[PDB]
């Protein structure tokens, strides 16, 4: 290995001399405690090392050694239902060793080295295996963890272990060359895992929220973003999307956010149930945590570790959902590092390559044909935190040009305590058209037409709001007033949802379809009535309005009957009146 000595210490950055032959972006051990670092600049005989932990107390002249490898993760059984730090060190083991505090220099193994796994082989001696082929499978909380050939490995099988109890470190397959395959392998976080082919989005990613599922859907393998000022409600939305989604495995990344949020997730999830199968929610989650006060250089590593684990579980054939708690913190970490490097800032202090890094991260999402010929997907939802809420900010601008869906959060609605508080004017979705056949087959044969009508009503209401501002609601004619009232009914009774309510939290697609149908029928009837001369005031007093307003609180197994009752009541209310 290379062994050099510290030439200069300044914050988290250490200059090491005598490091000729060091390679860029390799892992190093700094000081006698063996703190982990990364070489980011080579100059003459020196190297620039950024330390992933606190450097207070180091001295000039202490050794620096180079591991010779870039940052990597251990991929294998034992990751689910676990919580990690920014570079994949289990936090429970750290707590057992150290205490309530996190001390530097602690080294632990990401996967448990003593647990016993039930191994059942799926290949036989003499067979030919390529990167990504399935060798054998072990049970993991009712899943089926498939053991994979590492992506750069090919050869012929000499011997295979019989079924039984083994640990992760026991090599179960040996090849002709002599390379031995264990139950786990390592992959560098900065290299995308290779695939066979990239597919087109085909099916929706059911988030459980009416506004997102209906107006701005996102497809499996798609990408979305949720920018907004603090207090608007990103964290609640992301937690709900983790809890209610239809994804097989959920990977949550806490890039530099409030720790109490991680604690809330940790405390609450073991008491919730997976909607898909009924087991506890936490048996499908990998939770990467990196609070605000944790070392600054580890946020980028946190993002990369999260997406790499997601890619692995996609290779297994599952459909993985990934949430990045805040990418603005990732940008801030990059800015701090570049400020240490004395690099030229590009705009607002950000380094030049911020857009390149963001694009490289967001392009890892998609639906693919895996190297083993199985099908899988990764869906990425990143949260953006502009400084003042200014949407001209370079991070929001850069992420605006790469995502397929945009969910802009309104501060005014957040002040009103009107949630989900999504600014309808500034939001869009490009996955609308590709999902139409699926909607016809699974929801209703006319679902696209209803959502088009709802969108047209909203556009007309927003268009009239200018005149409403100019002269006031009292000066509009009856038809325009009716359109305003219909827009208000839609906003208050359809787009609004309560996350902490027992019933309103999750709404299936058919329920949303029925609610939209009811509202549209009422709009037809009111228009016909005003064309007959009925005064607008009585229309706003009919008893069916409370039924429309209350429809969202109806539990799922009661909705089919209540919908028919409400439709009959809406028809009768205007049939009898005139």
């Amino acid at each position: 290995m290379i062994q050099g000595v510290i030439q200069k210490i300044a914050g988290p950055a250490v200059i090491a001399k005598g490091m000729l032959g060091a390679r860029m972006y390799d892992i190093c051990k700094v000081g006698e405690e063996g703190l982990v670092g990364e070489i980011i600049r080579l100059d003459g005989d020196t190297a620039f090392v950024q330390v992933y932990e606190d450097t207070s107390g180091l001295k000039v002249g202490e050794p620096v050694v180079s591991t010779g490898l870039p940052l990597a993760v251990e991929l294998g059984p034992g990751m689910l239902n676990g919580i990690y730090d920014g570079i994949q060190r289990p936090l429970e083991r750290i707590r057992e060793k150290t205490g309530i505090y996190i001390t530097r220099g602690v080294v632990v193994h990401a996967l448990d080295r003593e647990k016993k796994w039930a191994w059942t082989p799926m290949v036989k001696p003499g067979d030919e295996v390529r990167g990504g082929m399935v060798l054998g499978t072990v049970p993991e909380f009712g899943f089926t963890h498939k053991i994979l050939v590492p992506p750069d490995v090919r050869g012929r099988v000499k011997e295979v272990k019989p079924a039984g109890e083994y640990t992760v470190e026991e090599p179960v397959v040996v090849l002709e060359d002599g390379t031995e395959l264990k139950m786990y392998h390592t992959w560098p976080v900065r290299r995308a895992r290779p695939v066979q082919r990239k597919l087109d989005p085909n099916t929706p990613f059911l988030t459980g929220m009416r506004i997102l599922d209906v107006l701005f859907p996102v497809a499996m393998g798609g990408t979305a973003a949720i920018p907004g000022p603090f207090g608007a409600g990103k964290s609640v939305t992301q937690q709900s999307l983790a809890k209610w989604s239809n994804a097989d495995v959920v990977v949550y990344v806490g890039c530099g956010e409030r720790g109490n949020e991680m604690t809330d997730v940790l405390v609450e999830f073991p008491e919730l149930t997976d909607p898909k199968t009924g087991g506890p929610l936490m048996h499908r989650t990998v939770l990467i945590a990196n609070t605000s006060n944790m070392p600054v250089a580890a946020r980028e590593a946190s993002i990369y570790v999260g997406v790499t684990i997601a890619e692995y579980f996609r290779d297994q054939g599952f459909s993985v959902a990934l949430m990045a708690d805040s990418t603005s913190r990732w940008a801030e970490a990059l800015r701090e590092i570049s400020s240490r490097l004395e690099e030229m800032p590009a705009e607002e202090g950000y380094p030049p390559y911020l857009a390149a890094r963001l694009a490289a991260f967001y392009e890892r999402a998609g639906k693919v044909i895996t190297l083993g010929g199985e099908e899988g997907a990764v869906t990425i939802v990143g949260a953006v935190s502009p400084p003042g809420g200014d949407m001209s900010e370079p991070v929001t601008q850069s992420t605006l040009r790469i995502v397929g869906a945009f969910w802009r959060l309104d501060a005014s609605l957040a002040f009103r305590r009107h949630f989900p508080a999504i600014n309808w004017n500034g939001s869009y979705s490009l996955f609308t058209s590709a999902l139409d056949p699926w909607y016809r087959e699974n929801v209703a044969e006319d679902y696209p037409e209803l959502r088009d009508a709802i969108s047209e009503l909203l556009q007309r209401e927003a268009g009239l709001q200018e005149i409403v501002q100019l002269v006031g609601p009292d000066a509009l004619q009856d038809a325009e007033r009716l359109v305003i009232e219909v827009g208000r009914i839609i906003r208050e009774d359809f787009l609004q949802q309560n996350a902490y309510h027992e019933v309103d939290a999750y709404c299936s697609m058919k329920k949303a379809y029925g609610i939209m149908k009811m509202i549209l029928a009422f709009y037809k009837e009111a228009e016909a009535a005003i064309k007959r001369g009925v005064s607008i005031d009585e229309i706003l007093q009919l008893p069916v309005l409370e039924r429309i307003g209350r429809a969202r609180y109806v539990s799922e197994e009661e909705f089919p009957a209540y919908f028919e009752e409400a439709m009959k009541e809406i028809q009768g209310a205007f049939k009898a009146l005139a």
């Binding site: 210490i9 505090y101 603090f230 800015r335």
Partner: protein, 471 residues
């Protein structure tokens, strides 16, 4: 250990910085003391060491130093503070020396002031409700034990009075939650950064009048003291608080006087070192540096103690897009924003309910923790007040003679809200009285309006008359 190593060879003194050559045995972050030709001894910290030289920030002013007779000696490799249980009732300056005239303390142990981050697995979810006696906080922005809740203030607004009143009236209500009336007062740790003599006099006389000085620890850095000591004072305060709470199961309330002065000092150091500024001159690591301060509060599983943090900061020109309030909003769990428009009208305390927010609110409100209708009542109040403001703007645009009766009811509701729910001069309200006043205010609108409150609660509570509250 007991050896004293000195370094001459100072080559550069400018502003707060001082370069000493050789000195490769000064650890990064070490604490030193600068002795000049006249014998006076200052203090300082190493912020960057190299083979050529080391960089030292001088805590005091640098008057009278010279390159020919000064020397620098090492004190310890890691900055530490001496803690004990017997600092309750003492006063210190920003650097931690006593200023109350009494002998120096004797530490039970020495703890590093930079602190260590709490393991998220070890933390605990905060549940316990704190009744501050202020309606605009208790009902709408509930404060729970273990939360940090800054107060966003302004140039002339009275944030100090609000903080003092909160500390004077803050208490939990175990009778409502049925946990046994343990009845333990909050211990107050007070950290001041560049606080003027007028405000300091006010706080001292207030604590003296309430008698809470017997269980208070004070760290004071007045406006005339050196400006570099402000980097250490919050960390001294939080180390003391964490020791007390998690070593003796105390319940500590921390008040930080002015984080604005802290950021002033931070960028002064950052600009002396010629580093790339992030925004308006502030360093690019201000987010990390502030997060190392704010995040040292919370509650730890298996321990009875707690640290509740109330920073106070002044928004320049009342702009919450300024870097300081912006970053603090990204770090803390909410904010209580004061409004000058209420202050000019004579409303105290001038808490604006709309931009205010409490993130941990619904961990601590509901059935078994307070009265049942808390959450829905708060939501309905928010909706109605927003409607009132919107109608105010409508009247600004067009004459009010076109207003419907509905608009008039909402407008009168907003006025009554501002004059009765918010306005209370130095008055302690139990949560019951505040909820009763809230229902009385809501009874100004028909049951058809109150969409966000369930019918059962309407049946039990709607219909009170505001004029029956007081005789």
């Amino acid at each position: 250990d007991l050896l004293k190593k000195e370094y001459t060879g100072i080559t550069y003194i400018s502003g707060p910085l001082l370069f000493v050559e050789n000195a490769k045995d000064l650890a990064y972050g070490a604490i030193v003391d600068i002795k000049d030709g006249t014998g006076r001894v200052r203090g300082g910290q190493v912020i960057e060491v190299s083979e050529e030289y080391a960089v030292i920030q001088v805590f005091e002013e640098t008057t009278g130093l010279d390159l020919a007779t000064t020397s620098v000696s090492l004190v310890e490799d890691v900055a530490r503070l001496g803690v004990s249980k017997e600092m309750l009732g003492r006063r210190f300056n920003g650097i931690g020396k006593p200023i109350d005239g009494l002998p120096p303390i004797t530490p039970e142990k020495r703890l590093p002031i930079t602190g260590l981050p709490l393991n998220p697995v070890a933390r605990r979810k905060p549940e316990q409700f704190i009744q501050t006696g202020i309606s605009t906080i208790d009902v709408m922005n509930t404060l729970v034990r273990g939360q940090k809740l800054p107060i966003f203030s302004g140039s002339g607004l009275p944030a100090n009075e609000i903080a003092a009143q909160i500390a004077r009236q803050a208490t939990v209500r175990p009778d409502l939650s049925g946990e046994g009336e343990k009845e333990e007062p909050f211990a107050v740790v007070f950290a001041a950064m560049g606080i003027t003599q007028r405000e300091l006099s006010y706080f001292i006389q207030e604590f003296e009048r309430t008698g809470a000085l017997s269980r208070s620890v004070l760290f004071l850095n007045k406006a005339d003291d050196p400006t570099i000591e402000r980097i250490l004072t919050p960390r001294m305060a939080l180390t003391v608080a964490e020791y007390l709470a998690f070593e003796h199961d105390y319940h500590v309330l921390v008040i930080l006087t002015d984080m604005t002065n802290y950021c002033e000092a931070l960028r002064e150091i950052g600009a002396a070192r010629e580093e790339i500024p992030g925004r308006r001159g502030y360093p690019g690591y201000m987010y990390t540096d502030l997060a190392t301060i704010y995040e040292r509060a919370g509650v730890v599983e298996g321990k009875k103690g707690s640290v509740t943090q109330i920073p106070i900061l002044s928004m320049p020109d009342d702009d919450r897009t300024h870097p300081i309030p912006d970053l603090t909003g990204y770090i803390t769990e909410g904010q209580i924003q004061l409004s000058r428009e209420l202050h000019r009208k004579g409303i105290y305390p001038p808490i604006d309910p709309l931009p205010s927010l409490s993130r941990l609110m619904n961990n601590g409100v509901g059935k078994g923790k307070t009265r049942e209708d808390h959450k829905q009542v708060s939501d309905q109040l928010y909706s109605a007040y927003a409607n009132g403001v919107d109608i105010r703007k409508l009247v600004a645009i067009i004459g009010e003679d076109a207003l419907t009766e509905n608009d008039r009811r909402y407008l009168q509701f907003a006025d009554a809200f501002e004059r009765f729910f918010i306005n209370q001069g130095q008055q302690n309200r139990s949560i019951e009285e505040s909820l009763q006043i809230a229902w009385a205010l809501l009874s100004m609108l028909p049951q058809g309006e109150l969409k966000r409150i369930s019918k059962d609660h309407i049946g039990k509570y709607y219909g009170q008359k505001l004029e029956e509250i007081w005789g």
